[PDB]
Amino acid sequence: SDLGKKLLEAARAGQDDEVRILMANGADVNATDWVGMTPLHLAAWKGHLEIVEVLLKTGADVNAHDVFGTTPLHLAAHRGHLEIVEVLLKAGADVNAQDMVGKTPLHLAAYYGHLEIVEVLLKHGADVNAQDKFGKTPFDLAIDNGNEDIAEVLQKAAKLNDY
């Protein structure tokens, strides 16, 4: 319990050596903080690639959901961490996971303007027609935020899917 708390703190802070020390001493790799986030959540969100990699290699739950229903892939998509998105997907991240209001990682990547992540997600089977609880698709969010390059890529994928 104490090691897990320290592991969470180390993962958030990007302290690679502390993370490994704690893991080598039995720290629960899937420990959760007060909002249900795991070391993998925090390292993925903050862009700490090496910590993500060691966590995944050692068996961390790639699709753990926090209290908001967001997964590590959601979080990497939010902050635009492309290489982390790729390793998460290779480790089995659910490309179409939905948080508590129905948002998928594609929603987040489209809204927050991360074009490359959008393309990678689509390539891994992201649902271009996914609607959140308010009926918004990723395309709607790109349009709402004036992310026109992303909107075009999403339109292309939808036109392919519609054939």
Numbering used by the authors: 14 to 176
Give me lines lifted from the publication on this model.
Here, we report the selection of designed ankyrin repeat proteins (DARPins) recognizing mTFP1 (monomeric teal fluorescent protein 1). Here, we report the selection of DARPins recognizing mTFP1, one of the brightest and most photostable FPs in the blue-green spectrum. We characterized these binders both biochemically and biophysically and determined the three-dimensional structure of one DARPin-mTFP1 complex. The two DARPins we report here bind specifically and with high affinity to mTFP1.
The complex with DARPin 1238_G01 did not crystallize, but the structure of both isolated DARPins was determined as well (1238_G01, 1.6 Å resolution, R/Rfree of 16/18) and (1238_E11, 2.1 Å resolution, R/Rfree of 17/21). For DARPins 1238_E11, a high affinity with an equilibrium dissociation constant (KD) value of 3 nM was determined, while the affinity of 1238_G01 was found to be lower with a value of ∼88 nM. Similarly, upon mTFP1 binding, DARPin 1238_E11 remains structurally unchanged and exhibits only minor differences in the N-Cap region (Cα r.m.s.d. of 0.45 Å). Comparison to the crystal structures of the individual proteins showed no significant structural changes for both proteins upon complex formation. Anti-mTFP1 DARPin 1238_E11 and DARPin 1238_G01 differ in 13 out of 21 selected library residues, suggesting alternative binding epitopes, in line with the ELISA experiments.
